[model samples]
Target: SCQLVLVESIPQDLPSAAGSPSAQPLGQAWLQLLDTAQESVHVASYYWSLTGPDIGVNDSSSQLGEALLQKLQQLLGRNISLAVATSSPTLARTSTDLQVLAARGAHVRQVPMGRLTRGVLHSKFWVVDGRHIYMGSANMDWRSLTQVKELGAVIYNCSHLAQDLEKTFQTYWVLGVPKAVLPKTWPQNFSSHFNRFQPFHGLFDGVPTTAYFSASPPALCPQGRTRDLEALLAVMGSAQEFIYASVMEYFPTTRFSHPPRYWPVLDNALRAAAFGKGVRVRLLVGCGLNTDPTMFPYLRSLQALSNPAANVSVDVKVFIVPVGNHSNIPFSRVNHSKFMVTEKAAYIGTSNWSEDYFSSTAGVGLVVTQSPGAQPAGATVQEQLRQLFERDWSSRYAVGLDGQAPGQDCVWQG
Candidate 1:
């Protein structure tokens, strides 16, 4: 069994409304995890930057980043085995911290996405001492720690699950380091296997847990292992009670900037679950920070969908993390979570729920089956995530859209 602790990101700096410690959230949990490592640390992230005076350099996440860097330095000083794999050539030009860490003796390698696959190394996870695993949507950046509403879990003392996560890291390590291709004489034990049907079993808080891994196309993912979206459909389809999903972006079609094709795949699964099997669907998307033109209306269509006999009901909410006191720091506060918590399982990932994130880009997600007698009724992870999603879904910042709410305009070019 393992312990799953939810590490939340409070995008706004505010005082306690109901006297609950005032939400002084930070990324210190990450440093604490690093500190607990006695042997090795493997980190996979999408971004790392030291230049965030844009969000105000004096901000807390800046302070938090300093602490993290200090911890990494201390680990390096002890000659601990530290390896980091990150996306490169695209987001690489901005990672000044990677260069500094490399100089400080951290084994750092940039995954060149163009050669390896069409996807970037878009997973944010860390394994410490081959026992503790941390996974979520937060990038290893100042903004993620301070200005983004992100959700992740720190799973402790589960070597059985940790080693499986380690294998995914090793596959990326091999791709990023020894070059983007598998070595002809690669070690036999270091094979890439992301089985979907056959999961690695473990116990989380005495509840039996099953974990599955996923990778993108072009790479030779295991024969039986399915990609992320396919697996998500299967799990969401089986939702007997509810399907609660929150993401920064959601489009079942291609080219989000363009008009959606009103596509199928996951869209079909959601529709089938709602219209055929009578599953309650609730989706919380991020708005007031960033969004495409056509996305919100489509979400409205789903919410307004009608069925004659089936319990085809869909409710949608938008999370707008308010920046109450911060001024002109640069950048935007965002709700950047990508997870779907159902009555049966939980799927946490680093990719947005779009066809692009699923089919074209490199992303990773873990599907954990609920233990029979875990807690309450669902799996431990699912229960934890359910509580979190419920909080954000009903928060003051999350509001119902009239299908015509205008999107935020930031003149973004990226």
Candidate 2:
């Protein structure tokens, strides 16, 4: 009895089209998962910031955050076990939420991914009672509920898949032990049986669906587990007609490494899908106050591939989530969705497009393929995601590279 539902969060001021498709709000989804926990709930997030004070802000927008924290605290009264895995170096900035959770009997561990893989744990997911799950682009931040755009999915009564995700959570859990060592190779017990070649076949919401999970940073993935980069490339390689991708940033090179060098693996794949396979490709990148200007030349380079003489098609647009009166909030107004839909399948992932995210950062990706003849093709989650992309693509907020120059409301350097 596997059932899946799409979940997302739109910025406080971002308006949707009259008939645009919508999903369950991210806050409601988390609350639902929390309410259903019977015995154990395991959560893996980049960090914890459930209130404005967590980041030294005083915005009332954190009302949802306070509610979420209160709910987590109430879980202790029910005798439900709670555990959290977050990135290390958290002590530098500190999350009062984590401290509060620990004081209330929640077991929390901080995985030092930087020491192990030269990166941070960037994955976001939850496993409740070993039967329900949630994963997406939202960090455990107050802004994720209202001030920022985010997307993810919740699966109900899917213990088989939930356990699979729990294994990833466990991987983080073990690493949090004091002075733990990175295994030379992950043990066999951590291996996966699902991948692009052998996806998990199940009935999602009574519709036939094929799904699988992928983890990032090859060093951490065990035998038979698919790497995130491999899964993304396979999705692009198999596209027959069109590919629609929306992300916060798109750089062909590493963003955080010293002396960043050119890394064009995904870039080459997009070009091949467009110029070689004659597949139409459109990319909607987030343009906000914090967006890096270096992305402009890279986007221009991809847009340059659209040539009628060569029968190529590649379109690029910047999605701006209006700051409105939220300008006082840093990094609040931005489209942070990190997913893509192609003619063949749909992908929801936790990482943005860049070298470091795939090479060194800890992230996760979910590939979903619905039955071709399922409910007129419009009822499947795949089509819904595609429509979501199209809606954002054609919205008044999306502007082409040639349409405008950098400004306060437009794509500008931080």
Candidate 3:
């Protein structure tokens, strides 16, 4: 039997009302997986900044990161094999976490996704002992553990699914080799048998569940591997009641380019689902000190479609994690969670919502659907995700577009 857990990293000082449910903490989850590594541990991340000094900052909030780093450092003494893959064009080269780990008998490589696809590797995941896996938006950074809101999943005793994910990890490992090149097509060995069309049928926490893994950038996906964007579209299309999407950023346009143009693939799908099928659509986007003010108009445009006269519900809310005392930290306080919950499925992904992420970057997502047969008395991941979204949607930190303005909490964005 496979066990599934929803993991969360709620920033320190972030408040929730009484009776609100809490998932496994991200730091605790990582440590738990590390403790079980009897043979091998494979980890891939956008970058590594496991200490305040990694980014030239001095903050006590990074104590969790320091402790985690120390744990990783001790793994070598136990003779547990360690492998790490990071982005080639990592901006934070000052981060010595990888260097220290490499010196202490860890295999480390920098996948040059930028050279191949004009985008950097942005996937964050871990596979331990071929029996457990962790996938989410949290990077290998100190801030992701203590100063940012993050969401992910931890699967235990699911070697079948873990092996499939290891295929993707191996893809990065091979590409990181010297003088490597992207093949015109990935070999059959790299292709997966589990996807949206042919998902793995199994039991999750004693409940009958159907699950699959997805990756971004059509170039990176092999046969039977569903594209991340395609899975998201399918989820939205299949939803009959409502769809709750939460992400660090939401844009219908490309983010990094000379002149950004409209890329409304997902946006158009959301609009069609709301206007044509009368599906309730609510987006909980993140805003912080570094957020762009121009995103306000786009959010307001989506919110403009909320019309009770037509039964169309496309509400938009911006979530702001208060930057109380850590103002000096760069790119810190924000709701960095990225996922979506519908009546039919729950999706947890590692990429922000933007055109560039799907067009070129390397990312992964997990789609899970459950039935009421095996566990009639318990909650499914879908139900848990729906509750999480609702809780955040109604929180005081969520700002509606109707009265949006500059405030103390939403300091930089107006």
**Per-model TM values vs. the true structure:** 0.86, 0.97, 0.97
Instruction: List residue ranges in candidate 1 displaced over 4 A.
Output: 14-26, 50-60, 177-179, 182-194, 218-220, 256-263, 306-310, 325-327, 372-379, 403-414
For each of the candidates, the C-alpha root-mean-square deviation to the true structure, in angstroms, is: 3.9, 1.6, 1.3
lDDT of 1 by residue, 1-414 (tens): 577666777765622235232222437678778789989999988777654542235655577667677778888899888898887645535346777788998888878765555566777899999999988888877677766677776778877668767877877777776544745444655444446667776666766777776655435354444677777877887789888988887777776335545456877888888877778888888864345756765777777885545567787877766655554454457678888999888888788876667655677777877577726654366777787777676566677765333443321222
Off by over 4 Å in 2: 91-94, 373-378, 405-408, 411-414
Candidate 2: tens digits of C-alpha lDDT, residues 195-222 = 8899999978778889999998888887
lDDT per residue for candidate 3 within 375-398, as digits (tens), equals 468888899999989888888888
Which 10-residue span in candidate 2 carries the lowest summed lDDT?
405-414
Given candidate 1, what's the lDDT at residue 106? 87
> Candidate 1: minimum summed lDDT over ten consecutive residues — where?
15-24
lDDT of 3: 0.88
Clashing pairs in 3: none
